[PDB]
Each structure stands twice: as structure tokens, then as C-alpha cells.
Amino acid sequence: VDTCSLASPASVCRTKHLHLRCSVDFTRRTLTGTAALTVQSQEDNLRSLVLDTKDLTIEKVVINGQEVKYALGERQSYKGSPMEISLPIALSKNQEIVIEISFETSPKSSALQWLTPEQTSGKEHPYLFSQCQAIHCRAILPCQDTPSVKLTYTAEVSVPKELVALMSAIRDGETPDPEDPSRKIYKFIQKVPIPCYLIALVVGALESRQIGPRTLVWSEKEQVEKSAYEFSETESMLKIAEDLGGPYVWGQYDLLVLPPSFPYGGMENPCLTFVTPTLLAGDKSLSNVIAHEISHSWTGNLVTNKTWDHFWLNEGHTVYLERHICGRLFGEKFRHFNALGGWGELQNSVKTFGETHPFTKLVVDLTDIDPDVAYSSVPYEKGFALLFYLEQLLGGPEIFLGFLKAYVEKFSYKSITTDDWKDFLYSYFKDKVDVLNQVDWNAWLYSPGLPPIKPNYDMTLTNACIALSQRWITAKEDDLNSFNATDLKDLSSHQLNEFLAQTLQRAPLPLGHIKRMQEVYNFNAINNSEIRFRWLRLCIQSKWEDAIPLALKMATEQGRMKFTRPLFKDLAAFDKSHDQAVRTYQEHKASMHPVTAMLVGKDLKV
Ligand SMILES: Nc1cc(-c2ccc(Oc3ccc(Cl)cc3)cc2)[nH]n1
Ligand SMILES: [Zn+2]
């Protein structure tokens, strides 16, 4: 049923537990060790099984202290190579065996980026971080690389004693390596069953600062103190999340601020969220990303999508919870602001993808499609639009939040499909079934382009952005002298960002407008990467050669694909910077994140 995994489906067998013993070698850029997988059979007379692997080196497979026959199949592009294992016994239904696999990752592992000391803040020690979603755990160790199987796990990672190792699990102790005095072993334990894509590792000279009863903030010493401040409200947001979705079951909620090449804004790794360092805007304005990763602790990590065709169930509900968290902290008016802004983003994605593009469908068919290529904000906003529309259609946020909490408890620790979600919706809202039948489910779930109906959005906080953006778009020459910094006197960082987004859509603007806009607003001096990103896009799309070097620096000084990809594609579309953009990519391609370096290459057609 999962077209992205080459392993035995959950209907044949399930991995119950993973015991990982491994060592990080920065000299060769490999993890070597063993992966003991406790696997339970789901059928009678099970005599062999298949795992997922991608660029792994297998030494042997030991079962009950004896080596066993295994075979690796031909590689299937991004899916990797399937690994068959011959069992030393035939397992009847629900019986279990432990399989010990001696493996070693490839330096080209698509799940990891190896950073040289100069690629870090401290410039003295190397760095390693993982990114498994969607199907990259197979590039770290053999497993059923599919969200349809959930497993607990325990790990022991040997690392140079000067470094620290962290995982998506509770820290369970550290000691000097008994077989190597120059190394330390960090132990971890994750008692809540998870999909293997939530497995994460990080190794580096990490410092910590406690910002809450169950929250530490991790980063290099240069950024720890800044990050502890930027995210001071995490505990504040955890209690709101708990009130909406129920108890937080993962014990610890730590935060990890990675080096600038991290490919995404955040990764909802259990116990240790990964976030881009580009959130350090200095005013906490971009902290809603933390509210997002927090919400994933219920929608996504507790209730998980069965395949990646149903990824929208994860981010769709997560965005919904996030904007309710922000609404409880800043008012319902603010919640509608983000919802409306998100609907504007959904317009941008569709315009860029195309109204008929298959990647604008809510439920996709990733058969023979690299899930990384399908990743976009469409499942985020299109998913949220559906839930918001249902919230309004079903009687308000109070009623619908009651459904969300029940939905989470109903499928806790399980993996569901869109039909599972829809089926329980009709069960929960059995009194209003006739209202649900008014919904165009076929169009919402499987038709591409923008949804069939637009929700009702409060225009209060957005009106200020619309007035100013309209003045610039419709302004002629004689109107440019009157623009002044006072236009932003009562605008927040978010409103400033929305204004740019509103202006960005109607780009390009006359060259004089862009030059005047820099004179009066000085967007070049704003550190907020969301705002800077859009201001730069507005400049390059308007053919302003002065913004070329500023955009190349931001596209390469950080690796968040949200910014790096559009900036490059825009530089490649500008005639005056096409050559410089391509040449720049070729140079940095070798030291970019593997997933990021592959995608920009496709964007650039190199
Ligand atoms: N409009 C849409 C888009 C999708 C979609 C489904 C699966 C995907 O795989 C992933 C998920 C997360 C990451 Cl980090 C990388 C790849 C991406 C996107 N579903 N519906
Ligand atoms: Zn997310």
C-alpha cells in the first residue's frame, strides 16, 4: 500500500523495536555499527522479510548468534535497494525475532550532511545532523522505511569525547568509551512508538540552556543564549497545545538550532525539535514555527499518516493547531490574519505549480515520485483551508476543536489514511451528517488547484497591508515623493511581511518604485529572513541589478530551502544574474545539503 517503501508491508511483519549501536567517524564521514530490529510476524509461515536500504554497506546479518543469508537487490533510484533476509526459522503470526544487522553508511548518505569545522559557528569542530523525512532513514540503517510501522528504540552513539550526541529520544546517560579513551558514548531511549522518519541524530560542540521545566535549548555556544531568548515562550505554548490536543506524552521537549544549511524551518523530531537558525529574528516574530513543531507532537507524531500520499493529515492539522495556539496568545484577530496570509500563500503555490499540477491535489499519488520533489506548502495551506472551512461549516472553533482532540485520542500511536480521518469525521459529527454531505469531498481531496470554496476571513489586521501595497502597485511617478517611513509607523513585523507578499504577487514593479522603496523603508537593513527574503525577491523580479549580490549571499549563507530555492530560481530567471547564479551553485553544490543540492539542480536544470 506504501509505494515509497521497498520493504515488507505491515501486513507481513512490523518492526517493534530498534536497538542501535553505532559510532560516528568524521574522518570518513560514516556511521558504523549494528541495528538490532525486533520484528513481529503478521502471517503464518513467515520465512523471510525485506528491509529498506539506501547506499548502506552490509557486513553481515546475525540472528540468534548465527550469521544468516541476506541479499541486496538492484537500486531503484531515490527508493534505494531492497534487502531480503532469510530467517533461521519459520515464524507464525505475532511471533518475534531479533535481527542484528552490521552496517555502515555512505558519505553520500542523503539523510546526513557532514560539516567541516569552518562550516560551523565555532570553526573548530566538525558537525553532523540528520534529516530523515520523508524516506531517508533507509540511508542511515536498514528498516521498514514507511510511516505505517511505529517502533520504540534505544541507541548508543560513540563520538569524540569533545562533542555531544543528541537524538529524538530521552537522554539516558553518557560514559567514556571503554574501547577508545578519546570518545564518549551517549545513550538514548524513546519509549513512545514512532515512525522511523522521526529518528534523528546530531553530533557537535553543543551547549544547552533550560527555558522550561521540560525544555532545553541546544546550539553552538555562539547561538545558545540568543536561541533561549528567541524561544522563551515554548513552555507557554506547550500548555496551550496540551489544552487543545491533550497530554504531551513524550516527556521532554528540547529544541535544537542547527547550522545555517538546515534544509527546513523545523523538523518535528520527538523530544528534540530541529529548527533553522534563520528564525533568530531577535523579536520572536518568527516563533510561530516553534508552535508548529510543537503541535506535531500530537498531529503527526502521535497520529501519523499511513503513507506519504496522506502527508496532508500531518501538516494540515498541525497548521490548524499552530494558528489556534497563536490565536490564544494574540487574539482571534491574529489567527484570521495568519489564516488569510496562508490562503495567499496557497494562491502563490498554485500559480507557481499550475492550476492542474498533480502536486496541488490534497491527496497525492507518489508512485514513482521522489517525495522530496513533491514537498511544498500546498498540503500545509490546502489542508488548513479544508479544516478551517469545516470549522466554519460545523459551528465554530469550539465545536471543531472538540473533534480535533477526540480525533487525536482515537488514533493515538496509530497510522491512518484520509479515509480513516473522513470516516471518523462523519462518526464524530453524526448529528450534522447532512452538512458534511454539502462538502465537495472529491474536489477538496483529489482535485488539483485552489479549493472549490474560500473560507470567511477577518480583514482587520490585513487591511493596513492592503492599503499600503495598493498604493505602491497603483502609484505613478508623482506619487513616489510622498511615500515615507511613517507608512510603517503602525505596522508589525508580520504586517510588514504580508505587505511585501502582497506587493510581490504583482511584481515586477517599475525600477523607480523599487529604488524609492529602498530609500524610504530601508528593507535592506531588516534582519527578519521572512521579510528580507520577499524584499529581495521583489528586487530581482523587478530587474534591479543592485540586489544581485545581496540575494546570492542570502541564498548561500543559509540553506533553508524555503529561501534558497526561490532566490536561485529568481536569480536564474534574471538575465543579468543567470550566469552568476548557475556558476555560484556549481561551486557550493559540493558543500550543500544533499537534498537541497539535488533540488536546486533540478530547479536550475543543471
Ligand atoms: N499537495 C501535497 C503535497 C504532498 C506531499 C506528500 C509527501 C511529501 O513527502 C515529503 C514530506 C516531507 C518532507 Cl521534509 C519531504 C518529503 C511531500 C509532499 N501531499 N499533498
Ligand atoms: Zn510541519
Side-chain angles (χ1 to χ4, degrees), residues 3 29 59 84 235 247 300 331 338 340 366 396 554 566:
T3 59
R29 294 183 170 184
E59 179 195 50
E84 198 182 58
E235 180 51 23
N338 306 36
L340 181 55
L366 297 172
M554 185 186 180

mmCIF file with all atom_site columns, all heavy atoms in Angstrom, residues 3 29 59 84 235 247 300 331 338 340 366 396 554 566:
data_model
loop_
_atom_site.group_PDB
_atom_site.id
_atom_site.type_symbol
_atom_site.label_atom_id
_atom_site.label_alt_id
_atom_site.label_comp_id
_atom_site.label_asym_id
_atom_site.label_entity_id
_atom_site.label_seq_id
_atom_site.pdbx_PDB_ins_code
_atom_site.Cartn_x
_atom_site.Cartn_y
_atom_site.Cartn_z
_atom_site.occupancy
_atom_site.B_iso_or_equiv
_atom_site.pdbx_formal_charge
_atom_site.auth_seq_id
_atom_site.auth_comp_id
_atom_site.auth_asym_id
_atom_site.auth_atom_id
_atom_site.pdbx_PDB_model_num
ATOM 1   N N   . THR A 1 3   ? 3.748   2.950   -1.646 1.00 0.00 ? 3   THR A N   1
ATOM 2   C CA  . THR A 1 3   ? 4.529   2.881   -2.875 1.00 0.00 ? 3   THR A CA  1
ATOM 3   C C   . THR A 1 3   ? 5.924   3.481   -2.737 1.00 0.00 ? 3   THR A C   1
ATOM 4   O O   . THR A 1 3   ? 6.695   3.433   -3.701 1.00 0.00 ? 3   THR A O   1
ATOM 5   C CB  . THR A 1 3   ? 3.787   3.585   -4.016 1.00 0.00 ? 3   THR A CB  1
ATOM 6   O OG1 . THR A 1 3   ? 3.551   4.956   -3.667 1.00 0.00 ? 3   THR A OG1 1
ATOM 7   C CG2 . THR A 1 3   ? 2.458   2.892   -4.284 1.00 0.00 ? 3   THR A CG2 1
ATOM 8   N N   . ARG A 1 29  ? 33.428  10.139  7.349  1.00 0.00 ? 29  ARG A N   1
ATOM 9   C CA  . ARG A 1 29  ? 32.043  10.579  7.202  1.00 0.00 ? 29  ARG A CA  1
ATOM 10  C C   . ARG A 1 29  ? 31.108  9.377   7.074  1.00 0.00 ? 29  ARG A C   1
ATOM 11  O O   . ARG A 1 29  ? 30.369  9.228   6.097  1.00 0.00 ? 29  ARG A O   1
ATOM 12  C CB  . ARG A 1 29  ? 31.891  11.520  6.006  1.00 0.00 ? 29  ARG A CB  1
ATOM 13  C CG  . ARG A 1 29  ? 32.604  12.844  6.165  1.00 0.00 ? 29  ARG A CG  1
ATOM 14  C CD  . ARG A 1 29  ? 32.340  13.729  4.967  1.00 0.00 ? 29  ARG A CD  1
ATOM 15  N NE  . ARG A 1 29  ? 32.812  15.089  5.181  1.00 0.00 ? 29  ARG A NE  1
ATOM 16  C CZ  . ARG A 1 29  ? 32.636  16.083  4.323  1.00 0.00 ? 29  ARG A CZ  1
ATOM 17  N NH1 . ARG A 1 29  ? 31.998  15.902  3.179  1.00 0.00 ? 29  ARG A NH1 1
ATOM 18  N NH2 . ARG A 1 29  ? 33.115  17.288  4.619  1.00 0.00 ? 29  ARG A NH2 1
ATOM 19  N N   . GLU A 1 59  ? 27.746  -5.692  6.370  1.00 0.00 ? 59  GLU A N   1
ATOM 20  C CA  . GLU A 1 59  ? 28.775  -6.686  6.654  1.00 0.00 ? 59  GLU A CA  1
ATOM 21  C C   . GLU A 1 59  ? 28.181  -8.077  6.844  1.00 0.00 ? 59  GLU A C   1
ATOM 22  O O   . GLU A 1 59  ? 28.686  -9.053  6.287  1.00 0.00 ? 59  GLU A O   1
ATOM 23  C CB  . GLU A 1 59  ? 29.576  -6.296  7.900  1.00 0.00 ? 59  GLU A CB  1
ATOM 24  C CG  . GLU A 1 59  ? 30.656  -7.318  8.253  1.00 0.00 ? 59  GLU A CG  1
ATOM 25  C CD  . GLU A 1 59  ? 31.220  -7.147  9.652  1.00 0.00 ? 59  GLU A CD  1
ATOM 26  O OE1 . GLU A 1 59  ? 30.426  -7.049  10.613 1.00 0.00 ? 59  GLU A OE1 1
ATOM 27  O OE2 . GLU A 1 59  ? 32.462  -7.115  9.791  1.00 0.00 ? 59  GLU A OE2 1
ATOM 28  N N   . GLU A 1 84  ? 16.668  -8.409  1.289  1.00 0.00 ? 84  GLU A N   1
ATOM 29  C CA  . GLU A 1 84  ? 15.966  -9.605  1.734  1.00 0.00 ? 84  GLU A CA  1
ATOM 30  C C   . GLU A 1 84  ? 16.812  -10.349 2.757  1.00 0.00 ? 84  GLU A C   1
ATOM 31  O O   . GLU A 1 84  ? 18.040  -10.404 2.645  1.00 0.00 ? 84  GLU A O   1
ATOM 32  C CB  . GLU A 1 84  ? 15.644  -10.533 0.560  1.00 0.00 ? 84  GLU A CB  1
ATOM 33  C CG  . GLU A 1 84  ? 14.551  -11.547 0.877  1.00 0.00 ? 84  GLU A CG  1
ATOM 34  C CD  . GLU A 1 84  ? 14.263  -12.492 -0.278 1.00 0.00 ? 84  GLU A CD  1
ATOM 35  O OE1 . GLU A 1 84  ? 15.199  -13.186 -0.733 1.00 0.00 ? 84  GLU A OE1 1
ATOM 36  O OE2 . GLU A 1 84  ? 13.100  -12.543 -0.734 1.00 0.00 ? 84  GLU A OE2 1
ATOM 37  N N   . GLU A 1 235 ? 7.385   26.755  26.678 1.00 0.00 ? 235 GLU A N   1
ATOM 38  C CA  . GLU A 1 235 ? 6.537   26.192  27.723 1.00 0.00 ? 235 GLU A CA  1
ATOM 39  C C   . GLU A 1 235 ? 5.162   26.834  27.684 1.00 0.00 ? 235 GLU A C   1
ATOM 40  O O   . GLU A 1 235 ? 4.143   26.157  27.864 1.00 0.00 ? 235 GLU A O   1
ATOM 41  C CB  . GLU A 1 235 ? 7.189   26.368  29.096 1.00 0.00 ? 235 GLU A CB  1
ATOM 42  C CG  . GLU A 1 235 ? 6.370   25.803  30.250 1.00 0.00 ? 235 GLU A CG  1
ATOM 43  C CD  . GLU A 1 235 ? 5.925   24.371  30.021 1.00 0.00 ? 235 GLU A CD  1
ATOM 44  O OE1 . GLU A 1 235 ? 6.566   23.663  29.214 1.00 0.00 ? 235 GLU A OE1 1
ATOM 45  O OE2 . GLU A 1 235 ? 4.931   23.952  30.656 1.00 0.00 ? 235 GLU A OE2 1
ATOM 46  N N   . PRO A 1 247 ? -2.761  15.482  26.721 1.00 0.00 ? 247 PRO A N   1
ATOM 47  C CA  . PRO A 1 247 ? -1.447  15.441  27.372 1.00 0.00 ? 247 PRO A CA  1
ATOM 48  C C   . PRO A 1 247 ? -0.314  15.284  26.370 1.00 0.00 ? 247 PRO A C   1
ATOM 49  O O   . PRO A 1 247 ? -0.451  14.615  25.344 1.00 0.00 ? 247 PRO A O   1
ATOM 50  C CB  . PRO A 1 247 ? -1.547  14.218  28.295 1.00 0.00 ? 247 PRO A CB  1
ATOM 51  C CG  . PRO A 1 247 ? -3.014  14.009  28.500 1.00 0.00 ? 247 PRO A CG  1
ATOM 52  C CD  . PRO A 1 247 ? -3.649  14.409  27.198 1.00 0.00 ? 247 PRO A CD  1
ATOM 53  N N   . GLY A 1 300 ? 0.711   14.099  13.790 1.00 0.00 ? 300 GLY A N   1
ATOM 54  C CA  . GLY A 1 300 ? 1.899   13.720  13.051 1.00 0.00 ? 300 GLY A CA  1
ATOM 55  C C   . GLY A 1 300 ? 2.773   12.708  13.764 1.00 0.00 ? 300 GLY A C   1
ATOM 56  O O   . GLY A 1 300 ? 3.103   11.661  13.201 1.00 0.00 ? 300 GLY A O   1
ATOM 57  N N   . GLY A 1 331 ? -4.924  36.706  20.164 1.00 0.00 ? 331 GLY A N   1
ATOM 58  C CA  . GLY A 1 331 ? -6.275  37.104  19.829 1.00 0.00 ? 331 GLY A CA  1
ATOM 59  C C   . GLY A 1 331 ? -6.776  36.450  18.554 1.00 0.00 ? 331 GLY A C   1
ATOM 60  O O   . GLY A 1 331 ? -6.008  36.118  17.645 1.00 0.00 ? 331 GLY A O   1
ATOM 61  N N   . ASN A 1 338 ? -3.185  35.124  10.114 1.00 0.00 ? 338 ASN A N   1
ATOM 62  C CA  . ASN A 1 338 ? -2.346  34.048  9.599  1.00 0.00 ? 338 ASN A CA  1
ATOM 63  C C   . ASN A 1 338 ? -3.117  33.172  8.617  1.00 0.00 ? 338 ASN A C   1
ATOM 64  O O   . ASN A 1 338 ? -2.576  32.757  7.586  1.00 0.00 ? 338 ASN A O   1
ATOM 65  C CB  . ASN A 1 338 ? -1.806  33.207  10.755 1.00 0.00 ? 338 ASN A CB  1
ATOM 66  C CG  . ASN A 1 338 ? -1.081  34.039  11.792 1.00 0.00 ? 338 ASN A CG  1
ATOM 67  O OD1 . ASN A 1 338 ? -1.472  35.170  12.076 1.00 0.00 ? 338 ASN A OD1 1
ATOM 68  N ND2 . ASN A 1 338 ? -0.020  33.482  12.365 1.00 0.00 ? 338 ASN A ND2 1
ATOM 69  N N   . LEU A 1 340 ? -5.607  34.055  6.643  1.00 0.00 ? 340 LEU A N   1
ATOM 70  C CA  . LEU A 1 340 ? -5.695  34.779  5.378  1.00 0.00 ? 340 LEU A CA  1
ATOM 71  C C   . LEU A 1 340 ? -4.343  34.810  4.679  1.00 0.00 ? 340 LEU A C   1
ATOM 72  O O   . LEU A 1 340 ? -4.246  34.537  3.478  1.00 0.00 ? 340 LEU A O   1
ATOM 73  C CB  . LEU A 1 340 ? -6.218  36.197  5.612  1.00 0.00 ? 340 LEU A CB  1
ATOM 74  C CG  . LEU A 1 340 ? -6.382  37.046  4.348  1.00 0.00 ? 340 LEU A CG  1
ATOM 75  C CD1 . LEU A 1 340 ? -7.265  36.340  3.331  1.00 0.00 ? 340 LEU A CD1 1
ATOM 76  C CD2 . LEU A 1 340 ? -6.947  38.415  4.689  1.00 0.00 ? 340 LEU A CD2 1
ATOM 77  N N   . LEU A 1 366 ? 2.218   9.330   -4.926 1.00 0.00 ? 366 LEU A N   1
ATOM 78  C CA  . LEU A 1 366 ? 3.667   9.428   -5.054 1.00 0.00 ? 366 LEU A CA  1
ATOM 79  C C   . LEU A 1 366 ? 4.288   8.195   -5.687 1.00 0.00 ? 366 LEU A C   1
ATOM 80  O O   . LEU A 1 366 ? 5.494   7.965   -5.528 1.00 0.00 ? 366 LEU A O   1
ATOM 81  C CB  . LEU A 1 366 ? 4.302   9.690   -3.686 1.00 0.00 ? 366 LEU A CB  1
ATOM 82  C CG  . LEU A 1 366 ? 3.906   11.013  -3.031 1.00 0.00 ? 366 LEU A CG  1
ATOM 83  C CD1 . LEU A 1 366 ? 4.430   11.083  -1.607 1.00 0.00 ? 366 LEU A CD1 1
ATOM 84  C CD2 . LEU A 1 366 ? 4.408   12.190  -3.860 1.00 0.00 ? 366 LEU A CD2 1
ATOM 85  N N   . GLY A 1 396 ? -18.139 26.527  14.368 1.00 0.00 ? 396 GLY A N   1
ATOM 86  C CA  . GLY A 1 396 ? -17.182 27.361  15.055 1.00 0.00 ? 396 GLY A CA  1
ATOM 87  C C   . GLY A 1 396 ? -15.964 26.620  15.565 1.00 0.00 ? 396 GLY A C   1
ATOM 88  O O   . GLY A 1 396 ? -15.873 25.390  15.498 1.00 0.00 ? 396 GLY A O   1
ATOM 89  N N   . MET A 1 554 ? 22.380  35.661  0.558  1.00 0.00 ? 554 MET A N   1
ATOM 90  C CA  . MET A 1 554 ? 21.344  35.045  1.380  1.00 0.00 ? 554 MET A CA  1
ATOM 91  C C   . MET A 1 554 ? 21.004  33.637  0.903  1.00 0.00 ? 554 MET A C   1
ATOM 92  O O   . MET A 1 554 ? 20.679  32.769  1.722  1.00 0.00 ? 554 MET A O   1
ATOM 93  C CB  . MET A 1 554 ? 20.083  35.910  1.389  1.00 0.00 ? 554 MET A CB  1
ATOM 94  C CG  . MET A 1 554 ? 19.007  35.382  2.323  1.00 0.00 ? 554 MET A CG  1
ATOM 95  S SD  . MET A 1 554 ? 17.445  36.270  2.222  1.00 0.00 ? 554 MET A SD  1
ATOM 96  C CE  . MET A 1 554 ? 16.474  35.379  3.435  1.00 0.00 ? 554 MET A CE  1
ATOM 97  N N   . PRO A 1 566 ? 13.811  29.529  -4.079 1.00 0.00 ? 566 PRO A N   1
ATOM 98  C CA  . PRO A 1 566 ? 13.233  30.639  -4.855 1.00 0.00 ? 566 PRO A CA  1
ATOM 99  C C   . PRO A 1 566 ? 14.253  31.693  -5.243 1.00 0.00 ? 566 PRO A C   1
ATOM 100 O O   . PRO A 1 566 ? 14.212  32.204  -6.368 1.00 0.00 ? 566 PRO A O   1
ATOM 101 C CB  . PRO A 1 566 ? 12.164  31.207  -3.910 1.00 0.00 ? 566 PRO A CB  1
ATOM 102 C CG  . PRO A 1 566 ? 11.867  30.102  -2.952 1.00 0.00 ? 566 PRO A CG  1
ATOM 103 C CD  . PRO A 1 566 ? 13.161  29.372  -2.768 1.00 0.00 ? 566 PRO A CD  1
#
